[PDB]
Design a protein around this ligand. Sequence first.
Ligand SMILES: O=C(O)C1=C[C@@H](OP(=O)(O)O)[C@@H](O)[C@H](O)C1
Ligand SMILES: [K+]
Length: 436
Amino acid sequence: AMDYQTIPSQGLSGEICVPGDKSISHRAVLLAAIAEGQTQVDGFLMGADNLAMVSALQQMGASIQVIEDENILVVEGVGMTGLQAPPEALDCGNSGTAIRLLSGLLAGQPFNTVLTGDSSLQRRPMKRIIDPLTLMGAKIDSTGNVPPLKIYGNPRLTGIHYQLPMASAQVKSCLLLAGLYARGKTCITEPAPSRDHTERLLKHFHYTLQKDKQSICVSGGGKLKANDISIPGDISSAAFFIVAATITPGSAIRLCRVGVNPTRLGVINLLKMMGADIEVTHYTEKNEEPTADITVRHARLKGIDIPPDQVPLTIDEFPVLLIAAAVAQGKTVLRDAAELRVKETDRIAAMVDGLQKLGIAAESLPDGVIIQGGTLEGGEVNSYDDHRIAMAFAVAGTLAKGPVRIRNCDNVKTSFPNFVELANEVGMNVKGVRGR
Ligand SMILES: O=C(O)C1=C[C@@H](OP(=O)(O)O)[C@@H](O)[C@H](O)C1
Ligand SMILES: [K+]
């Protein structure tokens, strides 16, 4: 077992490239696997989650070459129908995105699959996918609507028209994947926009798609065409440094080549409301995906009523955003964020606990949190095995009055394998030490 241990920072400095986008990586290798022809993937995120997806695809006869130190996959497509029946259960480790997306992929296969993962994965909710898949003709067994899932593939799904009841991109993605195998039209209606990476990669792989109103549709039985993909940096990964530089005096940093999808821009929009100093420049577009350079300077913050339309666009950044709230002047309130409770861990409970442990008055609500802006002390917090709780409290350590001990950090590598190295390079202080 490994812990992080911080000491305060005298200012972040420098220019860094965060590594690849986790969400786009999962979609990119999945689609390339069943495409026709050879897809080269740059910027692929080499973490435990994306690698678990790579493994699962290989269990089913995908032809994937992994060049770890360059962040490159070379994928030799097997076509829509080229997958083979895996002999064992697919272990998705800690990755929610992998189990929910694979389920959509696997539902229309002419074979059977067991999908499972770690302790945390085994508590994450699956009704949200089981139900609409089932309306398309899937059979999926589970106890208590959590993994493991046993999927009795049906190569004769029929498309549905379906409204998301929570703003979930995984659910939307799961269903479009199934949609490519179903007879007729599949249409997802989404009341509140969620991350649209799947949509973009379909267009990229020259599967036609159609926006309608709030709706997006595909028809089953089209063909996916190989096309090289270059993955921009994960702005979720950049979010830790964006905060860290915001709250640490004397900080000024440039973050190169980060993805700036507006459906992912939450944390920047919200920090800006709070008074932060954040410049977005040099806009590109490689492979449908907006990419830009982000400059961050130390600024003093003010508490906000987080407007609830930003919740979907910030869902992964609330752990680190709440560190910002803790050291703002005044009160911050988060509402309509109950989704935070069903993540890798319950993120509202995890953040209330560690913030209190570090001297912050923070109060839980069933769908959010009330934070009273204050002063971070040193002490000890628990990560609850959640990568982003670990990384948020490593950020907190930059301003905290004394050292911060963050217990159990091995799952940081699920989304950010070089976090410590990049944190130290720009002037945070974070070190791996033995745990218990
Ligand atoms: O589709 C994706 O890549 C993701 C969407 C979100 O999940 P929900 O669909 O549960 O909102 C997010 O929290 C997750 O980390 C990654
Ligand atoms: K995860």
